[PDB]
Amino acid sequence: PDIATVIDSHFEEMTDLEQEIARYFLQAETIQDDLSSQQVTQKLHISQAALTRFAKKCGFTGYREFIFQYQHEAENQANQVSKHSPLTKRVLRSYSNMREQTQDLIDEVQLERIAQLIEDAERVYFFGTGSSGLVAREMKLRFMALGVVCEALTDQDGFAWTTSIMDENCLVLGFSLSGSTPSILDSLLDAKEMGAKTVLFSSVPNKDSQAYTETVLVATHSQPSYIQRISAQLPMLFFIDLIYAYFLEINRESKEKIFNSYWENKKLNGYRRQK
Amino acid sequence: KPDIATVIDSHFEEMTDLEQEIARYFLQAETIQDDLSSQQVTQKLHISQAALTRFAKKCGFTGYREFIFQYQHEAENQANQVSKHSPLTKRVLRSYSNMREQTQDLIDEVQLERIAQLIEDAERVYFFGTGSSGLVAREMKLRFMALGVVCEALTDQDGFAWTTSIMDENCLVLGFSLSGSTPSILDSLLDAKEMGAKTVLFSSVPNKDSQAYTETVLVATHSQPSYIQRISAQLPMLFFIDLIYAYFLEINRESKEKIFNSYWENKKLNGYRRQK
Ligand SMILES: [Cl-]
Ligand SMILES: [Cl-]
Ligand SMILES: [Cl-]
Missing domain, CATH: 3.40.50.10490 (Glucose-6-phosphate isomerase like protein; domain 1)
Structure with missing residues (x-):
């Protein structure tokens, strides 16, 4: 299960304060933020221990693992946009269309x-x-x-x-x-x-x-x-x-x-x- | 237009627990290879004729005979489909697709x-x-x-x-x-x-x-x-x-x-x- 599904699946085990943390990490533009514990703490006005408990409630070993994984999902998804030039795609499409x-x-x-x-x-x-x-x-x-x-x-x-x-x-x-x-x-x-x-x-x-x-x-x-x-x-x-x-x-x-x-x-x- | 597997799938959630077990059997790829006469099917699944008939009517047929007739005829008409290719043909085309990828x-x-x-x-x-x-x-x-x-x-x-x-x-x-x-x-x-x-x-x-x-x-x-x-x-x-x-x-x-x-x-x- 991806990050959103796990967070969603644990949302209703979470306290109201932990739901504010969940809300932050469910935002699309959060992936653009400095996700260290020292900057997420300041942005959300919460304590370092609260972040750790949030990550453990979602089934991670800690915050640091959560956020590294959070970025694995992001990285895998960003690699799914094509990196090729129009010219390259034209040639590839000529081959695939001939197969079809x-x-x-x-x-x-x-x-x-x-x-x-x-x-x-x-x-x-x-x-x-x-x-x-x-x-x-x-x-x-x-x-x-x-x-x-x-x-x-x-x-x-x-x-x-x-x-x-x-x-x-x-x-x-x-x-x-x-x-x-x-x-x-x-x-x-x-x-x-x-x-x-x-x-x-x-x-x-x-x-x-x-x-x-x-x-x-x-x-x-x-x-x-x-x-x-x-x-x-x-x-x-x-x-x-x-x-x-x-x-x-x-x-x-x-x-x-x-x-x-x-x-x-x-x-x-x-x-x-x-x- | 819609193949019999699609028909079964679409009534599956209306079916009783026993009917759902019957459906699961007919949805399997191997099942077209069995003797699919009501006599053999009842013995195989340990059900009654009536239960089989009730399953077929959940799928919108008058009874099992209509159901199985269609089921088997869709199967024997697949050999006639030009667009449904053999394992050999698919192996060759996949070789080309794999190489493009x-x-x-x-x-x-x-x-x-x-x-x-x-x-x-x-x-x-x-x-x-x-x-x-x-x-x-x-x-x-x-x-x-x-x-x-x-x-x-x-x-x-x-x-x-x-x-x-x-x-x-x-x-x-x-x-x-x-x-x-x-x-x-x-x-x-x-x-x-x-x-x-x-x-x-x-x-x-x-x-x-x-x-x-x-x-x-x-x-x-x-x-x-x-x-x-x-x-x-x-x-x-x-x-x-x-x-x-x-x-x-x-x-x-x-x-x-x-x-x-x-x-x-x-x-x-x-x-x-x-x-x-
Ligand atoms: Cl040289
Ligand atoms: Cl071409
Ligand atoms: Cl090959």
């Missing part, structure tokens, strides 16, 4: 469906340009570590090389934050032409309906202007992590075996670098 | 302004990382180059060697090492320092050897204890690069917006040529 917007866009049934497509494919490709090419490389790092045969392609030549060898046991995931990156949209159609399954990640719903096997709507940025937006990868990273978590639970034991084997070779390699 | 407590605003000023004052800026940290470096390169910074992203030892050999006192190197021990990054930053460059290490681990660099930025640790369940390794870094970027953009904002917009105009002009 992502959360409201999740279709768990679709994400588990996509997790299954990855598992069912023999070959998985991630297609993306610019900042979305970084997302594609990131996804490969995550999923190769669990044993998936995958590759990340980030230019027309790669998509050309890959789509031309694609078959119906291939799955391509394409990343286009804007939903209109010509090289991504047309490359996914090349892959579809060859028999592959196709997943499009985009922040705009577009006319992709029916065009690809799955279309995943990802968050838009909270900031209107381009120059002030946070990382362009982030809308996609949320969905990479979601699909990943779903995918890991599919035959986890074999996937954990592969991951741990990579880990062991890393430990051994690092030791040899030392020795 | 941890990041927020680690922000040293004076430091990040100091780094943005270093970027502004440098003639050449370099971003070093490998793995996912290399992706953070490539991203930072794109964002700062669009504001006119002369910068490059290096993601392997050959690239570190090419660049450090020609650095001087007007160079700045930002190195990303989430583990705080990546030898190529720590060593390459020390090579850059030997050449007179300023150095900034980003790491989730404040080691003593990090004190050698001009600045060290402490970034967040991950929430999940096991590596295999962690969310993206880029994320601790991305927060701080976005903060630095946001500060840097406000140093001589109009000159930097001119440069960003001039980028934009040059694309449009070539697009007019291509339409011809």
Whole structure:
């Protein structure tokens, strides 16, 4: 219980004189006063022993403990006002709002469906340009570590090389934050032409309906202007992590075996670098 | 609209002592897993049918059958709620929330302004990382180059060697090492320092050897204890690069917006040529 609740809870055990002391300490602007026994005594015109008895009636060891604690409450409360600059808060709000917007866009049934497509494919490709090419490389790092045969392609030549060898046991995931990156949209159609399954990640719903096997709507940025937006990868990273978590639970034991084997070779390699 | 738990709660204070014991049972999370037929419930709680019926009528139902029908149907329809997410989904989203919270407590605003000023004052800026940290470096390169910074992203030892050999006192190197021990990054930053460059290490681990660099930025640790369940390794870094970027953009904002917009105009002009 905070100070006011304890004082309030002992108020009616207190004498009229002790209620005057309680009244003083229940004032908001009292925290601004010199709360020594020698100044509170003078201000309230009361004796030093009366303050001690007041603190003990409230369940403290003495006055000094009471007033130090009284200031712990004050200190804890004052630290709850934010200490950050507007600029900082804007950036933090951009992240938290993308979590919230992502959360409201999740279709768990679709994400588990996509997790299954990855598992069912023999070959998985991630297609993306610019900042979305970084997302594609990131996804490969995550999923190769669990044993998936995958590759990340980030230019027309790669998509050309890959789509031309694609078959119906291939799955391509394409990343286009804007939903209109010509090289991504047309490359996914090349892959579809060859028999592959196709997943499009985009922040705009577009006319992709029916065009690809799955279309995943990802968050838009909270900031209107381009120059002030946070990382362009982030809308996609949320969905990479979601699909990943779903995918890991599919035959986890074999996937954990592969991951741990990579880990062991890393430990051994690092030791040899030392020795 | 109102779920059956809310309904029970709202009549709880009207209920008899025995009815309140019945309510307490139905308000428990595990109870939907029991056999909730009146026969089994009466035996379980050692009550009569009538008492169960009286409880259900206190809750505004005609009887227990109506009550339990609703109770169980609300439960089996929760699997259909898109907004009610699984333990896996919540684990991932909490990992992101936890990292935002941890990041927020680690922000040293004076430091990040100091780094943005270093970027502004440098003639050449370099971003070093490998793995996912290399992706953070490539991203930072794109964002700062669009504001006119002369910068490059290096993601392997050959690239570190090419660049450090020609650095001087007007160079700045930002190195990303989430583990705080990546030898190529720590060593390459020390090579850059030997050449007179300023150095900034980003790491989730404040080691003593990090004190050698001009600045060290402490970034967040991950929430999940096991590596295999962690969310993206880029994320601790991305927060701080976005903060630095946001500060840097406000140093001589109009000159930097001119440069960003001039980028934009040059694309449009070539697009007019291509339409011809
Ligand atoms: Cl934003
Ligand atoms: Cl220095
Ligand atoms: Cl995590």
